Design a protein around this ligand. Structure first.
Ligand SMILES: Nc1ncnc2c1ncn2[C@@H]1O[C@H](COP(=O)(O)OP(=O)(O)OP(=O)(O)O)[C@@H](O)[C@H]1O
Ligand SMILES: Nc1ncnc2c1ncn2[C@@H]1O[C@H](COP(=O)(O)OP(=O)(O)OP(=O)(O)O)[C@@H](O)[C@H]1O
Ligand SMILES: [Mg+2]
Ligand SMILES: [Mg+2]
Ligand SMILES: [Mg+2]
Ligand SMILES: [Mg+2]
Ligand SMILES: [Mg+2]
Ligand SMILES: [Mg+2]
Ligand SMILES: [Mg+2]
Ligand SMILES: [Mg+2]
Lengths: 304, 302
């Protein structure tokens, strides 16, 4: 060999840190990048779906299109904004079926119609495997990032956590037949829906907000860090779906571990005083913001 | 049973784009950028990609690839009459890659951004076999200029010179240990293209049709011709040639004319308007005219 520092040694976030320093950037750090424009703040963000990593060519295309758009809107919603325009960059092999690309865009069209945004352009490049890069532009009257959490705030999450991971694992079992609750979980993993119904709430009362893409514990660490505060979470407060409970029962798994470390749930994690709570939304208080460092669960500390 | 279903290779890049447009029932898709009405002005959205093994090699100076990544997207915005504001960079990276490669890439990206007065405000990092670079750029303009506004009688122009980038790449592929100064100037135009940000005002105020030359003059003229519903006629003898290019062709026995017509990645502008709107204080050259009909002609033939 020869020896020279490689990316695998720096870590995804150490690399981002370096990119930030080199660029001498100030906006880099949240789910979206807020820019000043016409008294409002436009929100720019991007996410990727790669074959062999986020999906397989065997997955139903329309669902992949839906997910592509959903995942980006999720970031925009999390920062208190509404999706407006999007571009889709595609890396495609010449052997892929035309109908695959067409069905994918039908799903894209469906999601855009649902979140009320629109794909206005994109790109095409030939490659080995399929690569999907989505760029989304949203807008808000008030940008809500990850460093505004206040001491005393309560910690909330939307819907249930852990579903996506169980669904993924079920997909991996490649079973010949799944029970209904299994199909529900699988569906939650394959076709997530961005919590666009929280936009007004987030844009109005949240001090800090972000979507949960990598898992509660891991994403809360990012939040606690930018806010320069501590966060106490209580296991028995974590919202668990019935299907998740049914899955853990059947496969001898612990529901709590899935709620804490399961990823790609695309729910929200935000903080504010308990009084701002809106019971019309399926939000659940799961912790609080104290002074200090790190993320704690039932008194014990844990990290990524 | 077997498969008799159409695959991409057979449909082609543009045939695929047409399907996507039809499927999305889109009206904006079609130009170098996507103009969207916002706050009384027009925001321009565009994206381009640079993949390892296709557009560049891991052995190319990283900072140059970083400069080019921003430049080709800014060139698109420039072609439709706008100025770059913000950009996102989505990176597909091999975990085995040297961290310095990534840092150097962003150094060139940084330089490009300070030069074109735009800013990279975010992006993405993903694991992959080969390096994949996808940049999203957002510009603004007080007047969008697509590829359909070409009027009859209009004169056809181009900026700078043509065919340099192709000589540059051919030189690069020779993997020589050393190059002559004129050869380096050529390699330079291929590796570090400079977007014609100096033509913004002109394009925004007096162009009927506009776009940048990315795939080559003839190839890109066609997109302009059919998109406007006219036929563009060009005179090869009026094509702008550089000394270094003519220099390269003589030394290697090449036809500099073919390079100006089919050479790609020059990133110069191709626009139309009446001869009268010509600004002598810019390096534009008249290469032909917009006449009624269809298709592209050069010295009579097509
Ligand atoms: N996957 C896609 N989805 C939606 N629109 C697309 C997609 N791919 C390309 N387009 C649109 O097709 C049109 C032409 O794209 P293309 O990349 O060829 O233009 P360009 O960027 O001008 O080309 P070059 O990069 O050679 O200049 C543009 O409007 C582009 O946004
Ligand atoms: N290649 C890059 N260049 C510049 N900034 C980047 C790049 N990649 C990521 N960033 C920025 O680093 C910060 C974190 O990126 P990251 O992908 O973690 O966003 P995210 O919201 O966590 O997405 P996800 O929900 O999928 O985890 C963001 O501000 C992002 O824009
Ligand atoms: Mg996120
Ligand atoms: Mg991301
Ligand atoms: Mg995300
Ligand atoms: Mg992530
Ligand atoms: Mg172009
Ligand atoms: Mg392109
Ligand atoms: Mg382009
Ligand atoms: Mg092209």
């Amino acid at each position: 060999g020869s020896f020279t520092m490689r990316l695998k040694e720096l870590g995804e976030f150490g690399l981002i840190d370096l990119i930030k320093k080199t660029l001498e950037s100030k906006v880099i750090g949240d789910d979206t990048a807020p820019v000043e424009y016409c008294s409002k703040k436009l929100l720019l963000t991007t996410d990727v779906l790669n074959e062999g990593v986020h999906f397989l060519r065997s997955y139903i295309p329309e669902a992949v299109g839906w997910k592509a758009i959903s995942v980006n809107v999720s970031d925009v919603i999390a920062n208190g904004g509404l999706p407006k325009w999007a571009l889709i960059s595609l890396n495609l092999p010449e052997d892929l079926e035309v109908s695959y690309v067409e069905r994918f865009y039908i799903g894209v069209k469906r999601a855009c119609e649902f979140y009320k945004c629109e794909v206005v352009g994109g790109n095409i490049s030939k490659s080995e495997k399929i690569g999907i890069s989505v760029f989304l532009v949203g807008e808000t009257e008030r940008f809500v990032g990850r460093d505004g959490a206040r001491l005393g705030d309560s910690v909330f999450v939307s819907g249930t956590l852990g579903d996506s991971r169980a669904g993924l694992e079920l997909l991996l079992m490649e079973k010949e037949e799944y029970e209904p609750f299994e199909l529900a979980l699988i569906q939650r993993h394959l076709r997530p829906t961005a919590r666009i119904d929280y936009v007004k709430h987030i844009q109005k009362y949240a001090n800090a907000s972000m979507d949960i893409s990598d898992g509660l514990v891991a994403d809360a660490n990012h939040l606690a860090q930018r806010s320069g505060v501590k966060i106490e979470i209580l296991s028995e407060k974590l919202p668990l779906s019935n299907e998740l409970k049914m899955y853990c029962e059947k496969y001898g798994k612990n529901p709590i571990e899935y709620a804490l470390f399961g990823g790609e749930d695309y729910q929200l994690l935000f903080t504010h005083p308990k009084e701002r709570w809106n019971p019309f939304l399926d939000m659940t208080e799961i912790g609080r913001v104290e002074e200090g460092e790190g993320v704690f669960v039932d008194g014990k500390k844990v990290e990524p």
